[PDB]
Amino acid sequence: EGFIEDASVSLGLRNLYFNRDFRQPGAAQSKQEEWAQGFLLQAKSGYTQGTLGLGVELIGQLGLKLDSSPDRAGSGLLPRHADGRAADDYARLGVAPKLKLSNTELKLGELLPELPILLRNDGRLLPQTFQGGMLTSREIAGLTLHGGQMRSLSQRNSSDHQDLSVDGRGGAFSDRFDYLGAEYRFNAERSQVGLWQARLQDIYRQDYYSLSHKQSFGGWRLGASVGLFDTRDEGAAKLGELENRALTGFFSATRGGHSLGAGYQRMYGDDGMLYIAGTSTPLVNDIQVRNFTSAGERSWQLRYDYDFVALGIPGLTAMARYASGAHARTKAMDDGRAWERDVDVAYVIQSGPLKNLGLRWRNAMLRSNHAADVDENRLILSYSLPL
Ligand SMILES: CCCCCCCCCCO[C@@H]1O[C@H](CO)[C@@H](O[C@H]2O[C@@H](CO)[C@@H](O)[C@H](O)[C@@H]2O)[C@H](O)[C@H]1O
Numbered sequence: 124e125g126f127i128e129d130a131s132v133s134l135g136l137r138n139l140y141f142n143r144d145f146r147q148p149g150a151a152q153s154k155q156e157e158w159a160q161g162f163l164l165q166a167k168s169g170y171t172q173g174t175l176g177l178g179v180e181l182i183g184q185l186g187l188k189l190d191s192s193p194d195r196a197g198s199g200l201l202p203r204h205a206d207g208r209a210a211d212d213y214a215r216l217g218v219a220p221k222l223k224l225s226n227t228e229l230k231l232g233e234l235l236p237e238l239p240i241l242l243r244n245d246g247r248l249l250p251q252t253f254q255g256g257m258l259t260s261r262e263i264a265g266l267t268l269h270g271g272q273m274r275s276l277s278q279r280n281s282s283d284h285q286d287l288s289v290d291g292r293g294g295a296f297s298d299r300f301d302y303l304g305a306e307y308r309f310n311a312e313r314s315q316v317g318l319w320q321a322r323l324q325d326i327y328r329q330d331y332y333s334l335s336h337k338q339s340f341g342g343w344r345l346g347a348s349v350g351l352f353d354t355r356d357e358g359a360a361k362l363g364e365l366e367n368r369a370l371t372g373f374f375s376a377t378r379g380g381h382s383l384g385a386g387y388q389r390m391y392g393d394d395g396m397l398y399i400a401g402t403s404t405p406l407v408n409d410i411q412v413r414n415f416t417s418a419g420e421r422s423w424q425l426r427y428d429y430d431f432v433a434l435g436i437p438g439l440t441a442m443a444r445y446a447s448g449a450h451a452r453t454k455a456m457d458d459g460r461a462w463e464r465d466v467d468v469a470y471v472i473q474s475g476p477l478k479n480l481g482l483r484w485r486n487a488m489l490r491s492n493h494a495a496d497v498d499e500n501r502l503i504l505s506y507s508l509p510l
Contacts, residue, residue, distance in 0.1 A: 126178065129169030131509070137161040138189075138504035139248050141198045143412070146496040155198040157209065158190040161248040166510075170223050180219040182233045184249045186280075187212050199280050200248045213282040217252065227260040238269070239331050239350065240302050240321040242403040247279045251401055254284055255300070269304030269319075278401045287323060288400045295361035299324035300399070306333075313338045317350075327365055327397055328357040346375040350405060354397045366392035369416070371406040373424070382428035390420045390451075408446045411465045411487040412499050415448045419457070422448035442467035453493045461491035481505035 143155040164183030170176030186201060193207035201209040217233020234253045235243050244251040255273035277284040286296040302321040308314070317333030335348040349372035356365040373386035386407035390396060396416035398404055408415040408422050415422040424446045431439035443466050451459030469483040483503040490496045 124172065126169045126171050130167060132164075132166040134508040134510060135161075135163030135165070136504075136506045136508065137163070137248060138502075139200055140500075140502040141200055141247070142500045143198065144498045144500075146498065150495070152195070152197070154195045156191075156195045157188075157198040157200045159200040159248050160187045160189055161185065162187075163249065170221075174224065176223040178221045178223070180221060180230070180232075182215075182217050182219065182235070182252065184215040185212070186214075186248045199246075202280050202282070213280075215249075215252075215277060215282050217254070226262050227258070229256065229258050231256040234273075236271075236273070238302065238304065238319075239317065239333060239405050240304065240319045240329060241273070241300070241399060242405060244279055244401055244403045246403070249279055251279045252277045265308050267304075267306040267308075269302065269306075271302055273300040274298055276399070276401065289323065289326060289362065290398050290400045290402065292362055293400065295326050297324045297326055310336075322357060323399070325358040326356070326361050327354055329354040329397065342378050344377045346373075346377075348373055352396065354394075365394050365397060367394040367397050367418075368392050369396045369406065371408070373407045375426075377428070380430040380433035382426070382430075384424075384426040384428075386424035386426065388415060388420075388422045388424070390416055390418060392418070394418055395420065395451075408448070410444065410446055410463055411485060412489050412497055413446075413461065413463055413494060415446060415461070417448075417451035417453065417459060417493075420448050420451040420459070422446060438471040438473040440467075440469045451493060456493060459491070459493040461489065461494055463487060463489045479507060 138160050140158045145153060162185040166181040168178045170178045188201055188209050188211045191201065191209040196203050196207060196209045202213050203209055219230055219232035219234065222229045234255065234257055235250055236253055236257060237243060253273045254275045255271060257271040260268040273287065275284040275286055286298060287300050288296045300321065300323050302319065304319040306315060306317045313336055315335045319331035321329045330353040332351045337346045352369040354365060354367045356362065368391040371388045373384055375382060375384035388406055388408045395418040396404065403409060404414060406414060408424050424444055426444035428442045445464050447462045449458065449460050453459050466486040471481040472478055485501045487499040
């Protein structure tokens, strides 16, 4: 009578071939080329009856080495020993109790947060996870309030957890990551304004402002979004004084399966974008291999999408984008330039025994006069088994 009625168990399967090719010689390491199979166990109970409902969730991970050689092993699909050898496997299991009162919900334990201020990475074999507690509340129509504290994370290619730190810096760690968020949706569900504040204890404080609108016009579906991060050092300020403002925004137009979109992004201040180690960001140029977040980096993006439904081939989609950056500072030089060209093709079998089986290919070129030039390919096989 509930609890057992809204319960679900799924087994996510991801077969991944990853090949990042470094073009410049001597690159010391010529290549990251690995192949792995991941398993993602997610089991949720429903909630016990009563005004205060209890429930529990479980996240299980298993990554298996299918092919690797130490000369080419840092791909991020697998943990990597000091000898340079990939692990043959790694696993992880976290439980997550949950309470629900009215329209307010609390989860503690192993978490998969997808927050503008803390976006869990899923760019390899197995998801990044966090450890702590999340509150989510929507007692008011249109409004969603967020609060929580994280204490540790587990990176995508690790069984283990570790204290939090900031991407690209390390050295300074924290026990305590506290946030608060508010999100108001209006104009017949079209417009939305967001407000966020996060505090990585004794390292940084980060504000985030968000503005977005989405509206259909006959056959056109236009979308506009703009966000702003403002990050300063905080407390004892272990990384020292920090100073980044980071702007992002795009506009998107879609009609008859075709999508075109332009994006802009700019890093202001002595520091580039500051975020939690290994985490993703909602910045528009956070793309396949690079995210264009170096100090002072100004960048834009043009993106094209097509949904092959219209041709009579549903499940087939294609995407291409070009990202260009300038004025990046890298001790060696200011006016650092880079450009990345991504190509995404995906197919999902829509009928038959193999319904929902998915194959996706991601290809990227990156060239720069500061970053390492790369060519990257990933083959991704996907399927989700309900239990
Ligand atoms: C379909 C997929 C189902 C897979 C389920 C299989 C069960 C998983 C068995 C191993 O699980 C892991 O064991 C690691 C070794 O013990 C732990 O390291 C963790 O354990 C800590 C101590 O608890 C520390 O040693 C580390 O830093 C790290 O956090 C970790 O938390 C745990 O998840």
